[PDB]
Amino acid sequence: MRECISIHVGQAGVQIGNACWELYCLEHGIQPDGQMPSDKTIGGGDDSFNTFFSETGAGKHVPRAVFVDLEPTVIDEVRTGTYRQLFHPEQLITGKEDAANNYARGHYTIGKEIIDLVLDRIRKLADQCTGLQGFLVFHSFGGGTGSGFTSLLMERLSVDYGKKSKLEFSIYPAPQVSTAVVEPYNSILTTHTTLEHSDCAFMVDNEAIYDICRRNLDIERPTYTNLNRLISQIVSSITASLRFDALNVDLTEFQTNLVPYPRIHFPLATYAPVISAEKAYHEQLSVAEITNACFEPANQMVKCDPRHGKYMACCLLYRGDVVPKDVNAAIATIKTKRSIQFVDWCPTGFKVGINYQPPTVVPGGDLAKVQRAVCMLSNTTAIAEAWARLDHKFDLMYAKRAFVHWYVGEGMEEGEFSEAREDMAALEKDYEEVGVDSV
Amino acid sequence: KREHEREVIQKAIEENNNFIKMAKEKLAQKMESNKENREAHLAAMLERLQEKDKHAEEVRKNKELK
Amino acid sequence: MREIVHIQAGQCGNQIGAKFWEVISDEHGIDPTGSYHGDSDLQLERINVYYNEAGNKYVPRAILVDLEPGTMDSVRSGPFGQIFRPDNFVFGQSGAGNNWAKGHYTEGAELVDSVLDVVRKESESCDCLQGFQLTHSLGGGTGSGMGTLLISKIREEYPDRIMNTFSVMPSPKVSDTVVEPYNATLSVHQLVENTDETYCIDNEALYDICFRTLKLTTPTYGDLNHLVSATMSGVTTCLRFPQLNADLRKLAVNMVPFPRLHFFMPGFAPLRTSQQYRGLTVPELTQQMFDSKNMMAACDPRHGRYLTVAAIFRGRMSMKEVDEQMLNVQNKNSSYFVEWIPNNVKTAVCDIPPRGLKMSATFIGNSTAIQELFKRISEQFTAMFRRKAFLHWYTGEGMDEMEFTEAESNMNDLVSEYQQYQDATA
Ligand SMILES: Nc1nc2c(ncn2[C@@H]2O[C@H](COP(=O)(O)OP(=O)(O)OP(=O)(O)O)[C@@H](O)[C@H]2O)c(=O)[nH]1
Numbered sequence: 001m002r003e004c005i006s007i008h009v010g011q012a013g014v015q016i017g018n019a020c021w022e023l024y025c026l027e028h029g030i031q032p033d034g035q036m037p038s039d040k041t042i043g044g045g046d047d048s049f050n051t052f053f054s055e056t057g058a059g060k061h062v063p064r065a066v067f068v069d070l071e072p073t074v075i076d077e078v079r080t081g082t083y084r085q086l087f088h089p090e091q092l093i094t095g096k097e098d099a100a101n102n103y104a105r106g107h108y109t110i111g112k113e114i115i116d117l118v119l120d121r122i123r124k125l126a127d128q129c130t131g132l133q134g135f136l137v138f139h140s141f142g143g144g145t146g147s148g149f150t151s152l153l154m155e156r157l158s159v160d161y162g163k164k165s166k167l168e169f170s171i172y173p174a175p176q177v178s179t180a181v182v183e184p185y186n187s188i189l190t191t192h193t194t195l196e197h198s199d200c201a202f203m204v205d206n207e208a209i210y211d212i213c214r215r216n217l218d219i220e221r222p223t224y225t226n227l228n229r230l231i232s233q234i235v236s237s238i239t240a241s242l243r244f245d246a247l248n249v250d251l252t253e254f255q256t257n258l259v260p261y262p263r264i265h266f267p268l269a270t271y272a273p274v275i276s277a278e279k280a281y282h283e284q285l286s287v288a289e290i291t292n293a294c295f296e297p298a299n300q301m302v303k304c305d306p307r308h309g310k311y312m313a314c315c316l317l318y319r320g321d322v323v324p325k326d327v328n329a330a331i332a333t334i335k336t337k338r339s340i341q342f343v344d345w346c347p348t349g350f351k352v353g354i355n356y357q358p359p360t361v362v363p364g365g366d367l368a369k370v371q372r373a374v375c376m377l378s379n380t381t382a383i384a385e386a387w388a389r390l391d392h393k394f395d396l397m398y399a400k401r402a403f404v405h406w407y408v409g410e411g412m413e414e415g416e417f418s419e420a421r422e423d424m425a426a427l428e429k430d431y432e433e434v435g436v437d438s439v
Numbered sequence: 440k441r442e443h444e445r446e447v448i449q450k451a452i453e454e455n456n457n458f459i460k461m462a463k464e465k466l467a468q469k470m471e472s473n474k475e476n477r478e479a480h481l482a483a484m485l486e487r488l489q490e491k492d493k494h495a496e497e498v499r500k501n502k503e504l505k
Numbered sequence: 506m507r508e509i510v511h512i513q514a515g516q517c518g519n520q521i522g523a524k525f526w527e528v529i530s531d532e533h534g535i536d537p538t539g540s541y542h543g544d545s546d547l548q549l550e551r552i553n554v555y556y557n558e559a560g561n562k563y564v565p566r567a568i569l570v571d572l573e574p575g576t577m578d579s580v581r582s583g584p585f586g587q588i589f590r591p592d593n594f595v596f597g598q599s600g601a602g603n604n605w606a607k608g609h610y611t612e613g614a615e616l617v618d619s620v621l622d623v624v625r626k627e628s629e630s631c632d633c634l635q636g637f638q639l640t641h642s643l644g645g646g647t648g649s650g651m652g653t654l655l656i657s658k659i660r661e662e663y664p665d666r667i668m669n670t671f672s673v674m675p676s677p678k679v680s681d682t683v684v685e686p687y688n689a690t691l692s693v694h695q696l697v698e699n700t701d702e703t704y705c706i707d708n709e710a711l712y713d714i715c716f717r718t719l720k721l722t723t724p725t726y727g728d729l730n731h732l733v734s735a736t737m738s739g740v741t742t743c744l745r746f747p748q749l750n751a752d753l754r755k756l757a758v759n760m761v762p763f764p765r766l767h768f769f770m771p772g773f774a775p776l777r778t779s780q781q782y783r784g785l786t787v788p789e790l791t792q793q794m795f796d797s798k799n800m801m802a803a804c805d806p807r808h809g810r811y812l813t814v815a816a817i818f819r820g821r822m823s824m825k826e827v828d829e830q831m832l833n834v835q836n837k838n839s840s841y842f843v844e845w846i847p848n849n850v851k852t853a854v855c856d857i858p859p860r861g862l863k864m865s866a867t868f869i870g871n872s873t874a875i876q877e878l879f880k881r882i883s884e885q886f887t888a889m890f891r892r893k894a895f896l897h898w899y900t901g902e903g904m905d906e907m908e909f910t911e912a913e914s915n916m917n918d919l920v921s922e923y924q925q926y927q928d929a930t931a
């Protein structure tokens with residue numbers, strides 16, 4: 001019950017979804033053929049892992065997700081990858097042409113071709129579910145598939161599934177790994193479009209993840225593989241309440257607390273401890289250490305200063321050998337030392353959950369296995385800085401209407417650009433309003 | 440009290456439906472506008488090329504005239 | 506399955522295109538018989554971008570076109586003349602006589618239709634055709650006039666396909682036809698409105714490089730071609746070997762801020778018997794790539810501003826080091842990069858280096874400086890056209906002086922716009 005269908009749009013979506021799924025197999029004891037020896041129930045069951053993994057007569061535990069990419073290349077490696085047996089052919093959907101980094105191409109010119117087939121596969125998965133809970137969409141703002149097709153699929157899911165949940169894992173563009181000059185355009189436009197169709201959006205800045213790997217993992221030039229593996233750890237901590245089940249707290253309750261107002265649905269995420277296998281050897285990280293780490297600004301997935309802003313919610317999702325008592329101490333300590341300012345309308349509390357299932361690392365990973373990890377999600381107004389930066393780039397190119405012709409030829413109109421930007425400016429003012437102290 | 444209870448739940452129903460409706464309409468408008476726009480562009484580029492073809496025919500008739 | 510139909514027209518176009526095919530054929534392990542013997546799967550992974558498979562014969566998806574058969578006959582005589590599909594050969598007999606009007610209106614017009622037929626057959630075989638690339642010279646008659654004519658007729662058939670032209674800028678040093686300025690300006694005009702992306706291969710520079718750098722007192726056409734072939738290999742390395750700018754459309758999307766400014770300055774490093782074994786440190790290699798001496802186009806980058814730039818580092822090298830070198834050049838050379846275009850420089854590295862190089866650097870940029878080259882062409886045209894020198898040539902085919910005017914104005918307009926964006930700030 002409470003099944004979740006996972007949707008992975010674009011190259012980034014797809015790859016990050018291959019990271020995640022592998023880690024989830026490793027955590028649940030699912031083998032690459034899908035056979036989970038631990039699971040005695042064959043063809044079905046009600047286990048937490050069944051919300052993300054469906055079962056078959058043979059005992060094979062198929063992932064509940066669909067990989068869509070307008071170029072075959074990325075999903076092709078999945079088709080031929082180690083976990084190719086786990087997935088099912090229909091679940092992998094690939095066209096023949098990419099959106100050449102163009103939102104317009106991916107939303108209209110190309111997307112329209114595959115959109116109906118995609119929704120079709122989702123619908124099949126939806127019928128398998130006894131009580132579907134919502135969708136998990138993974139994409140990148142910068143790419144044409146990750147922006148234009150992703151918004152299209154968001155609208156379609158709104159219509160066809162009504163107000164069912166729709167969470168998101170949006171890859172904030174990072175100049176270090178930038179692939180297109182026009183990525184700020186696609187970012188604004190997709191953010192504008194999906195803002196009304198997303199219940200809760202988690203952004204991950206490639207730059208921030210790139211830094212974390214170089215620093216904590218001592219990687220000279222982190223690859224998309226490094227990022228993805230770190231990303232999957234974050235994702236797994238967030239979804240761990242769903243896939244696993246006394247102290248564990250459903251992410252819904254966190255959601256009811258991380259969205260004070262519909263437009264404010266972007267929470268910041270900070271994970272700990274990211275450590276190399278040498279450094280983790282002969283070092284034990286306390287609940288207090290990992291907890292500090294959460295409040296450390298260099299450990300956050302998005303680059304922003306929480307101090308510059310105010311907290312509207314702050315949740316701590318732990319996993320591993322943790323006990324309430326230690327979590328209470330560490331929190332208090334933090335308090336004594338940190339400046340966790342809260343909006344006046346919001347209660348200055350930390351919602352916690354402890355999932356005793358310990359964390360797992362993919363073999364050959366650069367992440368050392370730890371006995372405890374934590375990932376704090378916070379609704380601080382600092383997130384706006386993000387938008388700003390982006391927006392500012394968008395404004396720079398758009399004043400000289402650069403690359404704008406590429407959008408217009410696909411059929412878009414400058415109105416869409418200006419409208420999208422206005423909405424971002426409103427969102428930024430909304431953050432400022434929520435921080436203002438009550439009269 | 441019972442009526443108001445029935446009112447609330449019908450309001451929430453109508454709210455969801457209305458959202459689905461507005462969403463559907465908007466997406467249908469933007470798809471058609473874009474589609475028209477794109478075809479227009481293509482049709483104008485083709486017509487420009489055709490006008491260049493006619494100019495070449497005329498240049499060929501000008502040479503034949505002499 | 507992102508096929509790129511290739512089309513080589515004119516004397517210059519046929520020669521440079523033959524070289525290109527030989528060189529990529531070596532890089533992909535394909536001999537003149539189309540047989541593959543490469544050591545690396547990477548050569549065959551994207552070989553379909555430029556090659557059609559067949560006894561497993563990878564045939565260049567090329568269409569040769571020249572109004573004089575001699576040039577194409579020599580091509581067939583040359584290495585790999587067998588590899589080219591014989592039906593792809595398409596040559597007339599009249600020739601253009603170094604007349605743009607002859608190729609764009611008369612003799613070209615007679616042969617254009619048979620060319621389009623081969624184009625249509627090649628495009629039909631393409632599963633996902635990216636577009637067409639044309640190798641040609643703007644000074645000659647078949648390459649320019651008939652070239653631009655082919656561009657326009659292909660665009661009508663494939664208005665949704667990228668259109669890339671390696672146009673060769675005429676040079677006074679190279680001399681050759683006297684009315685060559687007219688032909689170049691006619692070609693430029695068509696290009697300005699018919700080509701998605703254009704590589705300004707100025708022969709002048711090529712020469713200069715040779716005489717000076719290559720210390721060649723008498724640069725030959727073979728010398729120039731060698732420079733061009735190495736450039737072309739560089740600018741196709743991302744198209745032919747398995748991210749940045751991997752297809753023609755994405756390159757453009759990221760390098761053409763505005764449709765008229767689709768003209769770019771190529772650049773390559775290192776460019777000389779002296780071996781000097783030291784494997785140019787990436788640092789250097791970067792400096793040379795940005796060096797105006799390594800720019801195939803005859804413009805000083807420091808005299809303008811880079812709208813967008815793209816770097817390719819072939820050869821096994823430290824990706825971290827390359828990254829820092831690029832960032833550094835951008836930082837120190839910040840005035841030479843438009844501020845209104847965030848992140849306008851992007852770079853890629855390929856493990857397989859050019860033949861006989863442990864590593865290379867390829868420079869592609871839409872610098873506003875490119876307006877220098879157009880300016881030289883404009884001066885030439887204005888001098889001749891001031892006296893109507895050789896204008897009767899074109900008028901005989903039915904051309905009118907207004908056409909020349911319009912072409913001159915269009916080229917001045919392109920320069921104006923380049924200078925406009927150069928001198929615009931936040
Ligand atoms: N963190 C992370 N970011 C990625 C990854 N792959 C791609 N990206 C980011 O995605 C952006 C490009 O987005 P893509 O996923 O490739 O775009 P696309 O979905 O394929 O759309 P097209 O242009 O039409 O091919 C870049 O700015 C990268 O920073 C990844 O594997 N991990």
Ligand SMILES: Nc1nc2c(ncn2[C@@H]2O[C@H](COP(=O)(O)OP(=O)(O)O)[C@@H](O)[C@H]2O)c(=O)[nH]1
Nearest residue numbers: 515516517520642644645646647648681726729
């Ligand atoms: N770099 C280089 N330039 C060439 C070559 N062959 C011809 N050209 C140039 O081509 C121009 C003349 O064009 P041409 O080859 O005759 O075109 P055509 O009438 O269609 O054959 C001259 O300005 C030369 O500069 C070559 O092999 N290398």
Ligand SMILES: [Mg+2]
Nearest residue numbers: 011071074098
């Ligand atoms: Mg792609």
